[PDB]
């Protein structure tokens, strides 16, 4: 297990997400599904010129898996995935510059729900999660698990035993008071409200 420090601006963005009073928490799901869609577009685009990019899985989809017993909500996609280097470099985002633009925007009237416009929507997972695990497999690398309970650091390790083939899985270990996000009717409402036109099938698993 390797332990990394978040760059200062990311640590500050995370602290802001965790500590700012902001009721409209549900937007985290739209931001994660939007990230899954972008990654799925990327593998789709690569496959248009190289069909073999799909040998690791032809199906392009997003699954939402709540688990009341573990208190987790997991989002799985069969997108391009990330290499170990992408994971370390802020989950493939331009987080340092994005965070600055997000800050400047906040001071100009913007609210937390606009996070995705600054390329750092991933971090909105911390509105509802005490811990986030990102398991990912890209065609050019092995399967890795990134993890962070915030606090200024994240870990990266090799992941084994449940190979995914290709894609990203985001496991949200929910805060005690945010279990509404495990409820079928609540998830469906949020998907319908914010993710109605996503170009990939979104399957909500039942328990
Ligand atoms: C190097 C190519 N890989 C990717 O771009 C990628 N792969 N998986 C993801 C991904 C990231 C998160 Cl946070 C997520 O919730 C879902 C994803 O598929 C992404 C991804 C990375 C950054 C993004 O910034 C908006 C959006 C999606």
Q: Set out the domains of the chain in order of their start, with CATH numbers.
A: 1-207 (3.30.565.10)
Region for residue 111 given its phi and psi (left: phi exceeds 0; alpha: psi -120 to 50; beta: otherwise): beta
User: DSSP for the chain?
Assistant: -EEEEPPHHHHHHHHHHHHS----TTHHHHHHHHHHHHHHHHHHHHHHH-GGGGTT-----EEEEEETTTTEEEEEE-S----HHHHHTGGGS-HHHHHHHHHHHHTTT--GGGGGGGT-GGGGGGGTEEEEEEEEE-TTS--EEEEE-STTEEEEEE--SS--SSEEEEEEEE-GGGGGGG-HHHHHHHHHHH-TT-SS-EEE---
Specified resolution (Å): 2.0
In the structure encoding, which two tokens stand for residue 65, read together? 């898996």
* Closest among 193, 128, 138 to 168, alpha carbons compared: 138
Annotated binding site for ATP: 35, 77, 96, 122
Q: Whose CA is nearest to atom 11 of ligand 1?
A: 35
Question: Hey, which of 28, 78, 82, 148 would you mutate to test ligand 1's pocket, going by the most ligand atoms within 8 Å of its Cβ?
Answer: 82
Closest CA relative to residue 93, chosen from 19, 174, 6: 6
Cα–Cα distance, 185 to 177 (Å, whole number): 17
Give backbone dihedrals phi and psi of 168, rounded to 5 degrees, phi first.
Answer: -140, 140
Q: CA 101, CA 103: separation in Å to the nearest integer? A: 5
Q: Which residues pair with 204 in a beta bridge?
A: 64
Q: Which residues line ligand 1 (CB under 6 A)?
A: 32, 35-36, 38-39, 42, 77, 79-82, 86, 91-93, 119, 122, 168, 170
Ligand 1 centroid – CA 194 distance (Å): 19
């Amino acid at each position: 297990v390797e332990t990394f420090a978040f760059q200062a601006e990311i640590a500050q963005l995370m602290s802001l997400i965790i500590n700012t009073f902001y009721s409209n928490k549900e937007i985290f799901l739209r931001e994660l599904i939007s990230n899954s869609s972008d990654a799925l577009d990327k593998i789709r685009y690569e496959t248009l010129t190289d069909p073999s990019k799909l040998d690791s899985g032809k199906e392009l989809h997003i699954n939402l898996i709540p688990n009341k017993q573990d208190r987790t909500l997991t989002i799985v996609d069969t997108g391009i995935g990330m290499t170990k280097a992408d994971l370390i470099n802020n989950l493939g985002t331009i987080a340092k510059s994005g965070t600055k633009a997000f800050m400047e925007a906040l001071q100009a009237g913007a609210d937390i729900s606009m996070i995705g416009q600054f390329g750092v929507g991933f971090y909105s997972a911390y509105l509802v999660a005490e811990k986030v695990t990102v398991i990912t497999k890209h065609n050019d690398d092995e399967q890795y698990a990134w993890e962070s309970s915030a606090g200024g650091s994240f870990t990266v390790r090799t992941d084994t035993g449940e190979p995914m083939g290709r894609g990203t899985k985001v496991i949200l270990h929910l805060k005690e008071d945010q279990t509404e996000y495990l409820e079928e009717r609540r998830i469906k409402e949020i998907v319908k409200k914010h993710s109605q036109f996503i170009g990939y099938p979104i399957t909500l698993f039942v328990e």
